[PDB]
Amino acid sequence: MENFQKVEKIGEGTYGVVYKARNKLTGEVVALKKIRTEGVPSTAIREISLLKELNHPNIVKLLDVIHTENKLYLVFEFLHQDLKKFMDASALTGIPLPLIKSYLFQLLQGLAFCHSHRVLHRDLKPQNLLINTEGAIKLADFGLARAFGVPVRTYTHEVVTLWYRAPEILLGCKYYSTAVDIWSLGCIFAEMVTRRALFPGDSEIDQLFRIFRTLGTPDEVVWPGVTSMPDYKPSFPKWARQDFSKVVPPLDEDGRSLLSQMLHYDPNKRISAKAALAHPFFQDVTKPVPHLRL
Ligand SMILES: NC(=O)c1cc([N+](=O)[O-])c(Cl)cc1NCc1cccnc1
Numbered sequence: 001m002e003n004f005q006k007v008e009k010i011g012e013g014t015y016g017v018v019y020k021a022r023n024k025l026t027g028e029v030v031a032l033k034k035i036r037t038e039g040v041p042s043t044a045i046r047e048i049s050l051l052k053e054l055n056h057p058n059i060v061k062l063l064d065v066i067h068t069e070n071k072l073y074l075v076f077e078f079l080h081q082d083l084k085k086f087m088d089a090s091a092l093t094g095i096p097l098p099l100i101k102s103y104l105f106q107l108l109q110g111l112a113f114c115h116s117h118r119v120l121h122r123d124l125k126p127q128n129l130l131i132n133t134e135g136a137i138k139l140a141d142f143g144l145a146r147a148f149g150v151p152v153r154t155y156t157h158e159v160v161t162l163w164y165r166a167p168e169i170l171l172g173c174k175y176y177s178t179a180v181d182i183w184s185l186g187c188i189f190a191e192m193v194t195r196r197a198l199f200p201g202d203s204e205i206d207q208l209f210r211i212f213r214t215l216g217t218p219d220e221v222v223w224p225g226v227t228s229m230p231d232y233k234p235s236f237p238k239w240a241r242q243d244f245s246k247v248v249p250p251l252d253e254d255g256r257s258l259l260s261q262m263l264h265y266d267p268n269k270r271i272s273a274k275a276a277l278a279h280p281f282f283q284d285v286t287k288p289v290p291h292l293r294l
Pocket of ligand 1 (some may be wrong): 010011013014018030031033060076077079080081082100124130140145
């Protein structure tokens with residue numbers, strides 16, 4: 001509208017273009033996401049509206065949802081940087097462990113909150129984690145995926161990142177559980193630690209096989225029901241699980257232990273956000289100040 005004064009284009013979000021904008025009235029600086037269509041699902045409107053009440057310090061606040069002219073505008077509290085940029089910027093030195101730990105702990109608090117409220121993220125990735133100068137990190141775009149089917153190609157037909165997708169999703173499971181978010185977060189945790197994506201698949205099958213090559217091809221022993229999953233094929237090659245100390249060196253045993261529980265194949269054995277918060281890895285957690293250059 002005209003209530004907002006566009007400051008600049010932030011990018012081509014998962015659904016549409018994103019602008020940093022200023023409310024000409026409140027002077028508030030926000031992120032404005034314009035979403036793509038034959039009137040936009042009124043069901044999505046109701047659902048999205050619900051997300052406005054989902055308030056937590058580690059969840060990017062959804063200030064407003066405006067449906068007009070077949071266009072859907074989402075107004076979010078604004079944060080200056082995402083974790084992908086931060087990780088790229090810290091690539092040479094690595095994010096100090098205390099900060100990695102603080103971020104993981106805050107992200108789990110955010111997930112525990114969303115999950116206790118029956119809200120799933122479904123598409124967690126570094127890009128969707130925003131940080132500020134105070135050392136806070138927040139989950140962005142939480143319950144959107146459920147209010148808009150499944151991803152494939154953004155407006156500019158950009159390639160959908162499969163790197164953080166849980167295996168049950170890749171094996172065609174129809175009902176996501178809170179476990180898919182823990183999986184993505186485990187992938188992100190590993191990436192902050194090693195400074196390299198854990199499973200950088202460039203196709204759905206390559207994603208699945210990269211997971212299999214590292215964690216071992218799942219079977220009925222470690223994942224009851226896996227062989228009956230929609231896209232499971234008996235012809236999948238059978239790779240032996242790799243030693244976990246080789247996956248995220250030089251992370252300590254507390255860290256490797258937590259990660260392994262976040263990466264259990266069986267969604268039901270995978271650790272919950274709540275339980276993960278109690279893991280010994282967080283015994284000495286603190287809240288460091290990141291070195292952000294805005
Ligand atoms: N809530 C937000 O602040 C925000 C929202 C969206 N988005 O609605 O999709 C996106 Cl892309 C980025 C954001 N900020 C990070 C940022 C800020 C300035 C420049 N580059 C990145």
